Amino acid sequence: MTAAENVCYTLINVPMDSEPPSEISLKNDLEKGDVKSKTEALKKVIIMILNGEKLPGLLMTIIRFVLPLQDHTIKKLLLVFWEIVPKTTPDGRLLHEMILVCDAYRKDLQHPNEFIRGSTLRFLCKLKEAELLEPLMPAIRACLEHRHSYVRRNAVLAIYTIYRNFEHLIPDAPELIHDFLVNEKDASCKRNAFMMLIHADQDRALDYLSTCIDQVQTFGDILQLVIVELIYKVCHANPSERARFIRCIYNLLQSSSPAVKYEAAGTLVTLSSAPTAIKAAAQCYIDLIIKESDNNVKLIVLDRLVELKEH
Amino acid sequence: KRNVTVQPDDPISFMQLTAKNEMNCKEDQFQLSLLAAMGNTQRKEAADPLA
């Protein structure tokens, strides 16, 4: 695939003001430089690759002289480098050098620093090479039980993306994340686990919601938004479920969060065509337009009243 | 543009037999909106996908 057809997570349009560093200069700075010179050389290499330069000669230099460094900035820059660097031959085979990088990912998933583990798990969400993920699966699973919520929330996202792209690597993922969701206390970890179940196994997400449905009003706004998204998707696929969730969505119209009120009103209109339900949703939109000071909100919520009128 | 000529084989809608609460299943607007934003929505009308 050409760099233009490839998935692009990062764009950097830095004017290359100074003479573009020669590949030999970059190689010398990466091999012999101090941590600062290596950091600046690695930044330049990332910017050059993002701007369409192919630097295949630097791959082994980075593996040998930069990858074993324990500097936090270099560790993060290396994750951006591994996001953009070609990992396969033109014929789609994994580069032999990537086996050495896979052991570094395994070490970083076991790193004593929780932010290195979490950042590595976030990077693994962007990996499309199943052969690199397979040897990491035991370390990724162990990150679900990590003491820090920062590691656990990113481990759920990594498992979700691995299951979505490569189901055969983790066929038990929906069950593992359901058991995680039931036992979790952190609101961000709960949201990420629930979000995975919405996309991977809606029935397990509904089973969890059915245990907590009377408590949804007491949940944080982030978890309420993802619950409203589940209710929308489930009732859209299966109109018979609408009768079950109308009461929950109506309670969310009284949420303290204006974002939850907006999403609950939008969902209520999709659950019920009854005049009383439409009136409650329309009043919630009118109240949002009057109470919200931001003209962006006023205009967009007015467009929802215009869409309602088209029926 | 909405008045499609009713064909002889088109379904006859018996309003007396339809339950009053059948909301027309709108397409999932969130998924359509996401596909449109990514540029993966083939424009329905102009690019006959069999062109």
């Binding site: 009768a243 009461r247 109506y250 019920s272 065509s273 009854a274 009383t276 | -």
Partner: peptide, 24 residues
């Protein structure tokens, strides 16, 4: 034995009863 005014959730029940009266 004081007269109790206002039950929590009555507004949601009134909304649901209106929707039922509209055929939902």
């Amino acid at each position: 034995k004081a007269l109790k005014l206002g039950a929590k959730g009555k507004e949601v029940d009134n909304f649901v009863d209106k929707l039922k009266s509209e055929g939902e």
